[PDB]
Amino acid sequence: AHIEPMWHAWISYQVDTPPTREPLTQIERPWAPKEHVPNRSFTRGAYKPYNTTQPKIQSWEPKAAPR
Amino acid sequence: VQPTKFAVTVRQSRNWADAKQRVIAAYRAWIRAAPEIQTMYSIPFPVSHIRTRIRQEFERHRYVNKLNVVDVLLQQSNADFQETMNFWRQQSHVMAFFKEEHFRGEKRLPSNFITGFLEGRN
Amino acid sequence: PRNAPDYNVPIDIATSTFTPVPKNVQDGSEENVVPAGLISGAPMELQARTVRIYKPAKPATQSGEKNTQLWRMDWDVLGKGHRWENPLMGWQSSADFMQGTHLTFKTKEDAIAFAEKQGYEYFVQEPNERHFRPKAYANNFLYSPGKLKHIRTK
Amino acid sequence: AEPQDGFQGTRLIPTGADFQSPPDPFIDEGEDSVEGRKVRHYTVNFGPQHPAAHGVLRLILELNGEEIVRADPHVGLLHRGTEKLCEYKTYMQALPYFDRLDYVSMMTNEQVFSLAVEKLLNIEIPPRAKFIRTMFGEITRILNHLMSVLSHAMDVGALTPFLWGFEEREKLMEFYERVSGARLHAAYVRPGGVHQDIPVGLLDDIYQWATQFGDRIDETEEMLTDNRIWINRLKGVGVVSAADALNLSFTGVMLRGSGVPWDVRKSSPYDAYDQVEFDVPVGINGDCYDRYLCRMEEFRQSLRIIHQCLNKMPAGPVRYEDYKITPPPRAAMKENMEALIHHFLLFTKGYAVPPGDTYTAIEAPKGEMGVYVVSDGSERPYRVHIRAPGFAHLSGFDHITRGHLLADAVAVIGTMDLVFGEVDR
Amino acid sequence: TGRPASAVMQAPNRAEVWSRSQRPRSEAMAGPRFEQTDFDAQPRPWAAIELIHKQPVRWTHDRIVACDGGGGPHGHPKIYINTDKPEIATCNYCGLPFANEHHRKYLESLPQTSYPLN
Amino acid sequence: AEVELTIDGKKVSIEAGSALIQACEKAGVVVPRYCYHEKLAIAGNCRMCLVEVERSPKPVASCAWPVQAGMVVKTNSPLTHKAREGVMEFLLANHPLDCPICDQGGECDLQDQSMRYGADRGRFHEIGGKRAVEDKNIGPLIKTSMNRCIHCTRCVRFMNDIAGAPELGSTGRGNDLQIGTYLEKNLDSELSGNVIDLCPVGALTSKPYAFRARPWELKRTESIDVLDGLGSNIRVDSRGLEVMRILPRLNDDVNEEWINDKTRFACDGLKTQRLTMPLVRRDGKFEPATWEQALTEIAHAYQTLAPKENEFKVIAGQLVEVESLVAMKDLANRLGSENLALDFPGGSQPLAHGVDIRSNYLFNSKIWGIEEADAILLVGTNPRHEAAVLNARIRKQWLRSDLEIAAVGQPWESTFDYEHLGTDLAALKNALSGPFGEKLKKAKRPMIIVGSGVTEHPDAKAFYETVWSFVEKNASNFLTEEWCGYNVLQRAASRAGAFEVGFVVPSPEVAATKPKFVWLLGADEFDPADVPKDAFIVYQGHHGDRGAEIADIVLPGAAYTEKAGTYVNTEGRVQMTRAATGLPGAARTDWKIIRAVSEFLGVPLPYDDVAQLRDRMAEISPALAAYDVVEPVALRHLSKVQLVDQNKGAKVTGEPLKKVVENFYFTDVISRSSPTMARCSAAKETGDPRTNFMAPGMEEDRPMGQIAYGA
Ligand code: SF4
C-alpha cells in the first residue's frame, strides 16, 4: 500500500504511460492529500467510522412552568 | 430402515384407529430413547426432565381432530426422531429445544399486564 | 375468555422480548379450518399479531392504477422493536422479522382464507371507490344568465 | 374436495407400491451355523472438518470392512437461500447470484439465466453477443475442466498437472478481467447480451493463447492417459449403465461416459453453437476412465470452437437495441431525455418481464444446467428454481458406490464435477 | 474525545456544518471508540461547499447556457440554465455559476455575492 | 340513460354526456393522460389520450370526446400507437435531463408513460439546445423547477376552480408560455399543497420534502388525519423511524382526493418536541423517572389528597382517540368521578347540545350531502379555517348549481359568495324569519350548519333552541326519509368521539365541584380557569407544550402516526388509524397508561388487550364497531328534548359570535411544533414570497446560505 496511486496503475500494467508522462497527474487539486496515505490498519491511525447525521428524533426540553 | 437407520416410508393413516397406534408408537419410541438422548448429547438435565418435554410436545397436538394433519405431525416426529437417534443433530440443536437455556430465561413473555407494561412490552 | 390474553401460552425459540402475548393459538380442533399455523413451523408470534387486508389506494402522485388491482396482506408495526438507531453507524435496526414481508391476493376471500388458515389476527379495510359523475368539455363554456361567479382560464 | 376430505381420511391416494407388477416368471432371469451370523457395520463420518476430496461435504458411510454398504451425503452446508433472495431482487439484481452457484463456471451460469429471461422477454439478442457468449462459454468450459480434471488428479496423488494447468487458468482469468473487472464473478452475460463490448485488442490476445494451448493439453495427457497407476485408479471404477444414468438424472459427462450420445448444445442449440463445428466425446464403459477421456477431448473441442468464434465474430452491438430492456450507452444517457429516463427506470424499477414460466437448459461444463423461472408480469421474478447437475449427480453416489471399495470413493467424488454452491444453492 | 483541530473542524477548509442534519465532527468523533486514536490520520476531505464558491462567475450574453460539467461524456447530463433573473444562476449538477452581462452593473453593486464575480 | 358503445371490441355502457376516457376506465381500458384529472375540468391540451374512433378521420382526444349511441373505439391500433409515440416525443424534446436531481423520479407519470407508450431513444439533438425558463417564488411551501413543466394546466385549474385562489395562471405564448404568478406572491390557499401531488412532473414540489427521499424507499401506511374534524383519509409515507410526507388518498365521502396544508406539512412537528420518558417535577424542576416511579407517585398523591366525588377531573384534548376516552371514563367512574371535560371554552360545563341523541352533535346530512344542497346557512363558523376540504366541496356545488349561501357570525374571506346576515343570536332569529328563511323553507336539500364555536358561545343554549325549533317547524323539508337539514360541524377530531361515549360533564353539580386531582389527557387548549392552581396535575401526551409545562407528572404517550386509534369525524364516520412507526423512547400506548394507572390506583380496569377494550366500546355505542360507515340515526325527532325542551329557558346576552381560529397554522400541539407551520405563519405576516424564506438556499441578502429550516 506504500505505492503512490498513479504508479499503482503503472506497475499493475493497467496503463503503459508512467506517471512521469501522465497528464492526469498534473491537474492541480488543492484538496488532494499532500503526504502519501498508506494503509493505517494495525496502528492508532486506523479509520474509525461514525454516524455522520443527527438523531432522527428530539425529545422535549422539560420546562417546569412556575406556580 | 432401508435408506438409512431410522428411515420411515411416508404413508397415510387408513383410519383413526390406525393413526392412534402410530401416535402411541411414536411417543413410546421417544420416551424410551430419552436415556440415550441424555448421554449422547451430554444434556445437563435428568431423563425425567427430558421425558416431560416429550409429553408436552405430544400434548400441544392432543386436540387435533383431522386425519391429514395427524399424518403431517407423525412425519415430522419421525424426521425429528431419526435426526436425533442418528447423531445428525448437534448439542446446540437439542439444547435449543430446552427453553430454559436461553439467557433471558424461559418465562420469555410477561406474567400479566402490569409487568409487561412496566418493562415495555416484555 | 372473550379476547383475554393467554399469559400461559407455551413459547418457542423465536419468542423474544418484542413478542406480543397471544389471545388464540390454533390447536387443530377449529371447525372447518385447516390449521396451517400449527404445522407451518412459524413462531407463536404470528398468531399473536394482526395483519391488515386491504386494496392499496392509488398514489396521489400518479394516475397509474396498476398497484391497486390486487389485495395486500401486511403486518401492523408493533410499539417496540420495529426500528431503532444503531449507535455505531446510525443504521436502522429491527427486531420485527415480518417488517419487509407482504402477501398479494386476487380476492379478499382468498386473503381471509389464508389468514384464517395460518391463524393470523386480521382486519379487513374495504377500498374506497370513486363516485361516478359524467364530465363534459362543453361545461367549461356554459352561458351565465347572471353574475359570472367565477372567471375561467382554460 | 381436499383437504377437508382428509379431515376424516377417506380415499387414500395411490402410491407406487400399488402398481408393482410381479415379474414374468418364465423369462425372468433374476443350529449355530456361521452363515446366519450377523456382521456389524461401522458408520464413519467423512467431512467437512476432517479433510475430504473438496468442498463442504459431510459424507456418512456405512462400511463392511473395506466395502461401502450405504452412502449418505449430507448437504446444505453451503445452502445460502439463493432461490428465496432472488424473489426480492430485480432481474438485473438476481444475475450476480448466478455467478456464485457453480463458481468455476461463472459465465455459463449467468448464460442460462440470461437465456431464460430472454425467452420470456421475447427478444432476439444481436449476433455479436451470441458469438461473444459462445466464445466465453467455451473459455469457461476449459476453466472448469482445468479445475475439475486436475484437482481430481491431485486428489489421487498426481501433484504436477494441477500446477501446470492453473497457469492456464491464470491466462484465461485475465480475459475475464479484461471484459468485466473481475477474475471470477464477471456478471458479464446479462439478458439482452453482454454488459459491454470486448476491448479492441482482446481477440488477438485470445488467439495468441490459442496457438499454445494444444501443447498444454498434450503435456497433461503425457502424465495421465497412458500412466498405469492412473488407469488402475480409474478403470472399472464408478461404473453406471446407460439405462440407470438416465433414471438417476445424470447429465453431461456423467451421462455420455455410459455411451449415450447427448449434448444440449447439439440437441437444443442456443447462442451461436449451431454456427460452430465440434465433436461430442462419448465413452463406452461408463467408468471414471471413460469420463476422464471424454473431458480431455472436450478440452480440444472447446479450443476448436474458440478458434471458430475468433474468425466468425461479427460487427455490431453487444446489447439488444431497446433501451426499455438494456441500459443505454452512458453518452446517450447524458445527452437525450428518452435515454436518461430509460436509464433511471432500469436501475431503480427494472424492466418488466411478460408473465409466464419457462424451463431453460444449457450444456454447462458440469452437465445439464437448467433454470425454471416464473414471471408475474412485474420487475421481480415470482419464482427462480435452479437445476444444478451436481445435485442430481451426488444424489446417485449411493447407487454407484454401494458394494464397492472405500478406496474408490475419492475417484467417483472427483468423477462427478462437484461444486457445492451448485449442490446447495 | 477530541482536542486537536482535526477533531473539531468539520473540514480543513470549513469549521461549521453545511447541512442541518449533519453531525458536527466534535460530537461524531466523541465517545469511547475515539480514545487512543490519531485524529490527523482520520479521513477529513475538504468541504465541497467552500470550494465551489471560489469559482468565478462565467459571464455570457446568451439567455440560455448549456452545462455538462466540461468532461463531455465524463461530466453530467446536459442541462440548460436560464440567466434572465438579476442574480447568479448555478448549474444544479456541478454548481458552476453563470450570469448574464445585462445584470453586471447590479451584480457589481451588490455588497456581497455568492460567487467572486472575478 | 346509459348508452352502449364498443371499446377495443368489448361492450361498455355509461351515462350519456360522459367523456370517452370515462368509458375506457369503466371498460378497464388504460388510456395515457397528462392534462386530464377526474376532479378537474377537461382541458384537451396534452394530446396523450388520442384514440381511433370509427367514422372520425382525425385521431380524437378521449378526455374531450362525448360518448355516443353506437361508436366503436380502437385504443391499440397503429394510429393510436403512432399518436402516443409522436406526442411523447414532443413532450420530451424540451424536457430537462433532471431525473437524478428531480424529486418526482420513481413516481413520475412522464417516465412511466414514456417507458410504456413512447420510444426507447430520443431524436432531439439540436445544437440550439432546449428551452430554459426562470424559476418563480410562489411562497414557502412550493419549490419550483419550471423547466420540467409540460403545460397540462392541472395546477391552474385546481387553484382557480377548486381552491378559489385565482393567483396562479400562465403568461406568454407558444413555447414560451409559462405557469406562475405574473408577479411573485405567496399563494394564499390552505389547499395549495395539492398542486404538488397534481403536478405529473416535478415542476411544483414540496419545499420541506426537497431531496429527502426516493418513493421506493417509503413504507406506505393508509391512515386518517386527526388535525381536523373531517377525518381526511391520508397516506403516511415513512422510512423506518421517520415519517417523511403525508399524502391524500381517495375517499369521495370525506375528503375527495384532497387534504389541507396543515394536514400535509405539520408532519415535521412529529419529531421535535416529543415526550419520550416520564417526568416528575421536584423542587420546581422536572426530573426523569421510571414508569414504576411515576405511577407510584400518582398512587401516593391520590391517596394523600383522597379525592371525593368529582374532585377527580379529566380534560380531553383535540387529538385523543376513543380507546383513551373509554378507558379513562371507566377509570374516572371507578374513582367516583363523572367530571369528564373537553379542551375548549365551556368544555368543562354541560354542552348546549346534549349527547343523548347522536343527531344532536353530528353533521347529519353527510359531507356527501353538500353535493345536492340547495341552500346553506352557516352559523358561527369560518369553514375555510375549520374544514377546508369541506369548504371546497361547498364551492364546487356552488359553481355548478343555483346554491345560495348565507352566514351569521364573524365575516371571513370566502371562496364562495355568501350573504352575511349578522354576527349575533338576534341576527339568527331575523334570518330564519327573514328572506333567507324563505330560501330555506322553499328548498329541497336545505342545510343549517352550526360551528363548534357556537357551542363555546355563552348564548349557546339559545342558539341550538333557535336552530332546532326551525328544523321542527319546517320539517318534511328538513326532516325527511332522504334528508336531514340540521348539521353540527366539529373542527377537532376527538369531539364527536367523546360525544359518542358520553365523555361530557352531565350536570352543573359536577361542574361546580372544585377538583383536587386533574388529568390532562392530551389537553393543551384548556382554559386557565378549569385547572385550579392548587391541584395535582397529570399530563399524558406526546408533545411538550402548554399542558405539560404546568403539570406535576408528565407521562409520554403516542401520536396518531404511532398507534391504531379509533376516531369519529364530524358526520359520525368511525375510522381507525394505522401505526406507521413505533413508539419513541419510553412512550406507551395512551389507553395502556390509563389501564396501568388503574392497578396503581386500586381499581384495575377489566381489559388487558385492545380487543377487550374494543368490545367494551360496542357496549357503550355499537356504531364504534362499524368502521368506515356512518350508522343512521333512527329517532331524529328526539333531538328536541335536549335542544329545545331543556334549552327553552336560557339567559341571552347578545354577545357576538367569535373566531375560534385566530391563526390557522397554530391549532394543535403538532402544528405548533412544526417548523414548516412556523414558516407559513411568518410568511403570511411579512408577505415574503421567496421559497428559501426561512430555509436553506442562496438569497440575494444571504449569499452564504444557511442550514436552518424554520428559522
Ligand atoms: S419530471 Fe419526470 S421525466 Fe422530468 S426530470 Fe422529473 S422524474 Fe424525470
Ligand code: SF4
Ligand atoms: S407546473 Fe406542473 S401542474 Fe402546472 S402546468 Fe406545468 S406540469 Fe402541469
Ligand code: FES
Ligand atoms: S388527457 Fe386528453 S388531451 Fe390530455
Ligand SMILES: [Zn+2]
Ligand atoms: Zn454543470
